[PDB]
Amino acid sequence: NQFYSVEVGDSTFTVLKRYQNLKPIGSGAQGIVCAAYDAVLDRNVAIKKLSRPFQNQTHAKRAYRELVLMKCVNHKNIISLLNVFTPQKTLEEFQDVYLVMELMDANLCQVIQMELDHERMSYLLYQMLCGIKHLHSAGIIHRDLKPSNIVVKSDCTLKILDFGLVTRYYRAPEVILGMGYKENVDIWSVGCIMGEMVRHKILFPGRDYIDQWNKVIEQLGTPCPEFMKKLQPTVRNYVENRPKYAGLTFPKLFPDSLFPADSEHNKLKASQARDLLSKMLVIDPAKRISVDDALQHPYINVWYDPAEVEAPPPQIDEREHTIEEWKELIYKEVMN
Ligand SMILES: CCNC(=O)N1CCC(Nc2ncc(I)c(-c3c[nH]c4ccccc34)n2)CC1
Numbered sequence: 001n002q003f004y005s006v007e008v009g010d011s012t013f014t015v016l017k018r019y020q021n022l023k024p025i026g027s028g029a030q031g032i033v034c035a036a037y038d039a040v041l042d043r044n045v046a047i048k049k050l051s052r053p054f055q056n057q058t059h060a061k062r063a064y065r066e067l068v069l070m071k072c073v074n075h076k077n078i079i080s081l082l083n084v085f086t087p088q089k090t091l092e093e094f095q096d097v098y099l100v101m102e103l104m105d106a107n108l109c110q111v112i113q114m115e116l117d118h119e120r121m122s123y124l125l126y127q128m129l130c131g132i133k134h135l136h137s138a139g140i141i142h143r144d145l146k147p148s149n150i151v152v153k154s155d156c157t158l159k160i161l162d163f164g165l166v167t168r169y170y171r172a173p174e175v176i177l178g179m180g181y182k183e184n185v186d187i188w189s190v191g192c193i194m195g196e197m198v199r200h201k202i203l204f205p206g207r208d209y210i211d212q213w214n215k216v217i218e219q220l221g222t223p224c225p226e227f228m229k230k231l232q233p234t235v236r237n238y239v240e241n242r243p244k245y246a247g248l249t250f251p252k253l254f255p256d257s258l259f260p261a262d263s264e265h266n267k268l269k270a271s272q273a274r275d276l277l278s279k280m281l282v283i284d285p286a287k288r289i290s291v292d293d294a295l296q297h298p299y300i301n302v303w304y305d306p307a308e309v310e311a312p313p314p315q316i317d318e319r320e321h322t323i324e325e326w327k328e329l330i331y332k333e334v335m336n
């Protein structure tokens, strides 16, 4: 047989024999993931077993979308698909899908805990922006960027793991309040991640959206009439009846005490970093900085290389299907 089975991290992995010494490296709702040695390629890989891809239409659509996009997209800051397989021989027996990807060293949740380094932080932010720019050019607007679905190598090279559309702390006001969104909906999420790299605290924590919104207005201030008028009347009423906050200024939100101190370079960078935060963490998306403009910001633009930023977009998600239909769709996709 060309497969073998091993129990790993309380799941059964049935994989190609090329893949050896499977070790659990974590899990998500999307599936459980192992590190493995690929004997054919002489390199370590990550293997994801999709957890109950057919349990419902939501799972199926996500699995199909992930598979097709990860195949189509080829960018250095988006995780790339190395191989895909199922151990089952027929569509009727078809049950499991295995994704093989490059093995990364850590997700951002770990890196975020490290002591702030301007070189590191600006480089990570630059790469996130490059990945997001590339997704957007393909019509992919993520809406759920968060530290746990962003991964990095020991050398600080960074890749986004998924394609978006449970932790809700990184979601934009227009998403929370149901206003509709544009491309810079993803910039708010970057801003939350950056704010967290600085404070080592979740910016907008909260048991629920009510709690979350309170943290937003307490720190950033009650939004302007311009913004209010763009809300549904019914939503408008709740938001307007909250206590009015003047925002904390960004110097108070992100004081000098949180940044490397006592050199000229360090003074320079703290102010630049705060300026960028001030442009990303903007409640009204009409006033929030774009991806392209963020890449031009002095804090970010030191890393700018046209060959990384200006890559051609891929040339390829509203249709519904039965679970049986999605299954055949996924199967043919697996069989290439
Ligand atoms: C908080 C620190 N994180 C950490 O130490 N690790 C996570 C990432 C991991 N590397 C990897 N490399 C490739 C992939 I694809 C995935 C991965 C994809 N989906 C996941 C879901 C949960 C955990 C890991 C993954 N993960 C190494 C171990």
Ligand SMILES: [Cl-]
Pocket: 208, 209, 210
């Ligand atoms: Cl809620």
